[PDB]
Design a binder for this molecule. Sequence first.
Ligand SMILES: [Cl-]
Ligand SMILES: [Cl-]
Ligand SMILES: [Mg+2]
Ligand SMILES: [Mg+2]
Ligand SMILES: [Mg+2]
Lengths: 181, 188
Amino acid sequence: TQQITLIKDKILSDNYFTLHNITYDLTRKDGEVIRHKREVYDRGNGATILLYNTKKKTVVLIRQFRVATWVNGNESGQLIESCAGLLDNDEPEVCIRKEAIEETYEVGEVRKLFELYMSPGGVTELIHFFIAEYSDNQRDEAIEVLELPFSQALEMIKTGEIRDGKTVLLLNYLQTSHLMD
Amino acid sequence: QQITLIKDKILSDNYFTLHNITYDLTRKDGVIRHKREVYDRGNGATILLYNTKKKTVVLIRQFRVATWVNGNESGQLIESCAGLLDNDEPEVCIRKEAIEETGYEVGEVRKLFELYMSPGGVTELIHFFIAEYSDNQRANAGGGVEDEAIEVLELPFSQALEMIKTGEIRDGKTVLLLNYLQTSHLMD
Ligand SMILES: [Cl-]
Ligand SMILES: [Cl-]
Ligand SMILES: [Mg+2]
Ligand SMILES: [Mg+2]
Ligand SMILES: [Mg+2]
């Protein structure tokens, strides 16, 4: 796999985000040279934050219409997710504190977990994952604020009611962390 | 409540399809127009292989040009075995992908969930599986087929877990599987 030589980068779409067709030569371990041609969709990077309450034993999530989901088996298009946004010229922590105010709370301490490529087959997207405590100290649209029992959130992963990658990632992390114990 | 598709413009269509979708969303009050790009690459399946005797997992590593252009210096990415459904049912797809990529003929598998991975503008839903493997189930060396160039990694499960902390594993579905396995006590 070793040797990579970029050959061409053709822009297929420059509408708003960018779709590329990238051609590169890849030398396999047997020494054979294969030319790959691969579509790469660049819609930028993102941050997401699970909000939790240790005293109430609750999490706060958001529900909104996701058109990409609506065209692919999600009947209503509505999706339950952790608060998230695009890193829009902002550092991850700056982006996410701002998204926490807008979507849901002006949180205090956040904890960063990891930064993960969510769909590396054909999408550049890297997501910065955070958790943070919320209270009624730190306090009507298409974006519905959901406050639910953590035990309920876990159950909705089992039934399929919560079926978003980053959200399940975050809820599983909280489960194992002991912050809700 | 109500969603109405207004226009679906095809921005690109070679194998996969990029859309620009205009739709009208109705609120509680009762209409707002939105326009969003939607990238349709199809759905896929992924599997984490584990060995309770050896306490090992099997993962793969291959060049991902999409990570290369965005922070991943070498472009090499450690992931769980995965592929696109390409009109097979998820379990059919995944046993096929597992023997091609890892060399293992898997026995019984466990379905975990099916998750949208990047729902901001990608349709992709991934079917998640795990399966126990045995050394006597290795039929070949794996490595993929056609133009695939895949390195097969068998490693201590405790080692793959700490690679999540060090960033040596930085793939969403793979961390999801590894964390699911840890919570399961199957490797205890
Ligand atoms: Cl209506
Ligand atoms: Cl089990
Ligand atoms: Mg958002
Ligand atoms: Mg694959
Ligand atoms: Mg494959």
